[PDB]
Amino acid sequence: EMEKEFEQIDKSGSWAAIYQDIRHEASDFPCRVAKLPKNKNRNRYRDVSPFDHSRIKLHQEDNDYINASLIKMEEAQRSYILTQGPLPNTCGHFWEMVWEQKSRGVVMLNRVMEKGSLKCAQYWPQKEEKEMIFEDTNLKLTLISEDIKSYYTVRQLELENLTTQETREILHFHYTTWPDFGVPESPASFLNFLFKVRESGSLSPEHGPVVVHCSAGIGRSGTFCLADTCLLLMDKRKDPSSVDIKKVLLEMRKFRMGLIQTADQLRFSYLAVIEGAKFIHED
């Protein structure tokens, strides 16, 4: 079915109309903590905030606030943490969250710089011999190795809690080739990247939730979790054509606002689910 709906929407040029519908219908819940005066320098964008009911709380009190949300999908039996790209003053909070929530993987869907503007802090070490220390949260981070490919990079990191000298292996999955403008023409590399994350075991119930981000933590990040979930649901259910991608996206929007930011991103998500279901000189 999904193939044939996609065909009609493309023919009618109705992606923008469907997208405005999703926006009109979405949930609204309060975000009072995000809006406190003391939290102004913890938010990259004033119009992207976590709902109170689903925000992640830091355990090192004094201030428990981080721009991050728990997306808990009940039928699919998978959880994710969606967060903004860390700021220069929130990298310590980011790693504190990964530690406290027992995450095994971090998924990054942007480059630090795009279009000559900073989108995310350099929150991980680029060289084995030059480790990072976060003095405010008492954490050390070391690059162990990396595997660089044409469309994405996988890094092995070691995260140490200095208060206890406990260490843990964290996998960093970095999609390095999403366009400055628009979306990928083909979802093939996006699909190979998802399979890599799945195959690592980073998504399994034995771990804490995977941490997923882009710059705001709602657009590209939304496409990742929406596609993962719908593909889980295509497998679990007896007719995969029962899976309503609009309905799934509305359910996820109960836990974080804004997920999928453009009509182009909504079409790509459809596209990625249609293609992933099949496995289960101008310049």
Ligand X SMILES: Cc1ccc2nc(C(F)(F)F)cc(N3CCNCC3)c2c1
Q: Distance (Å, rounded) from C-alpha 90 to C-alpha 62? A: 15
Rounded to the nearest whole angstrom, what is the least distance from the CB of residue 119 to ligand X in the complex? 22
Q: Which residues in 98-127 contact ligand X (CB under 6 A)?
A: none
Among candidates 165, 176, 228, 164, which has minimal Cα distance to 202? 228
Rounded to the nearest whole angstrom, what is the least distance from the CB of residue 280 to ligand X in the complex? 5
Which tokens hold the place of 60? Answer: 């090192």
Taking the least distance from each CB to ligand X, the nearer of 181 and 279 is 279
**80 beta partners:** 71, 210
Is 23 marked as a binding-site residue?
no
Q: How far is CA 144 from CA 45, 129, 213, 215, in A?
A: 33, 9, 22, 25
To the query of whether residue 31 is one of the catalytic residues in this protein, the response is no
Q: Does 181 bind ligand X (CB under 6 A)?
A: no
Q: What share of the chain is helix, strand, coil (3-state, %, to 5)?
A: 35, 25, 40
Candidate list 122, 192, 204, 242; residue touching ligand X; CB under 6 A? 192
Among candidates 83, 84, 85, 100, which has minimal Cα distance to 159? 100
Candidate list 3, 16, 149, 162; residue touching ligand X; CB under 6 A? 16
From the list 91, 120, 214, 230, the catalytic residue is 214
Burial (0-12, 13-18, 19+ Cβ within 10 Å), 103: buried
- Give the range of 59-67, 88-96, 146-154, 260-268 binding ligand X by CB under 6 A: 260-268
Q: Are residues 85 and 213 in contact, defined by beta-carbon separation less than 8 angstroms?
A: yes
Q: Does 267 bind ligand X (CB under 6 A)?
A: yes
Taking the least distance from each CB to ligand X, the nearer of 26 and 263 is 263
Q: Which residues in 199-238 contact ligand X (CB under 6 A)?
A: 231
Burial (0-12, 13-18, 19+ Cβ within 10 Å), 211: buried
What is the total residue count of the chain? Answer: 283
- Give the range of 7-15, 25-33, 124-132, 172-180 binding ligand X by CB under 6 A: 7-15
Rounded to the nearest whole angstrom, what is the least distance from the CB of residue 261 to ligand X in the complex? 12
Taking the least distance from each CB to ligand X, the nearer of 10 and 75 is 10
The catalytic residues are 214
The residues binding ligand X (CB under 6 A) are 10, 13, 15-16, 191-192, 194-195, 198, 231, 263-264, 267, 276, 279-280
